[PDB]
Input
Amino acid sequence: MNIFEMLRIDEGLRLKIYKDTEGYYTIAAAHLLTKSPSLNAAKSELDKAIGRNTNGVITKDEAEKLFNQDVDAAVRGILRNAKLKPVYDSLDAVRRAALINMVFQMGETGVAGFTNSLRMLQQKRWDEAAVNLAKSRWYNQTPNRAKRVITTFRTGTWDAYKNL
Output
């Protein structure tokens, strides 16, 4: 288990264009292509990223290239952010994976807004951090995923991703 397996489980890896929970065309691991209702616009943005006429279907290798880049962006966003960086520096490897998972799902700005929970995580108060996170809007939206990520922050282990 590592950050890539973790995200593959929570996000999945689609090889064909699919619709977001808001109707947005997407692919790979929650990789936004376009916000317009036009499939053509979706297919066109995919081809510029891939470099060929995908017609809405890509290979595993291409899907994982997109995935790898997005995971790299999430990690960059953390290191360039004044609030995330110090928390990330203080976490062990497993909990770091949980921080990356959140940034990847919500973006560096969104996660940076959890100022209390972050301070909690920095001071190593796992149990309090978990309870505080459990009553967020994020948790309410995606219960199963948020529970797995919270459990990871709490325990410092991968049990929530091994017992499925």
Summary: Residues 1-164 form a domain with the Lysozyme fold (CATH 1.10.530.40). The radius of gyration is 17 Å. Strands lie at 14-19, 25-28, 31-34. The longest helix spans residues 60-79.
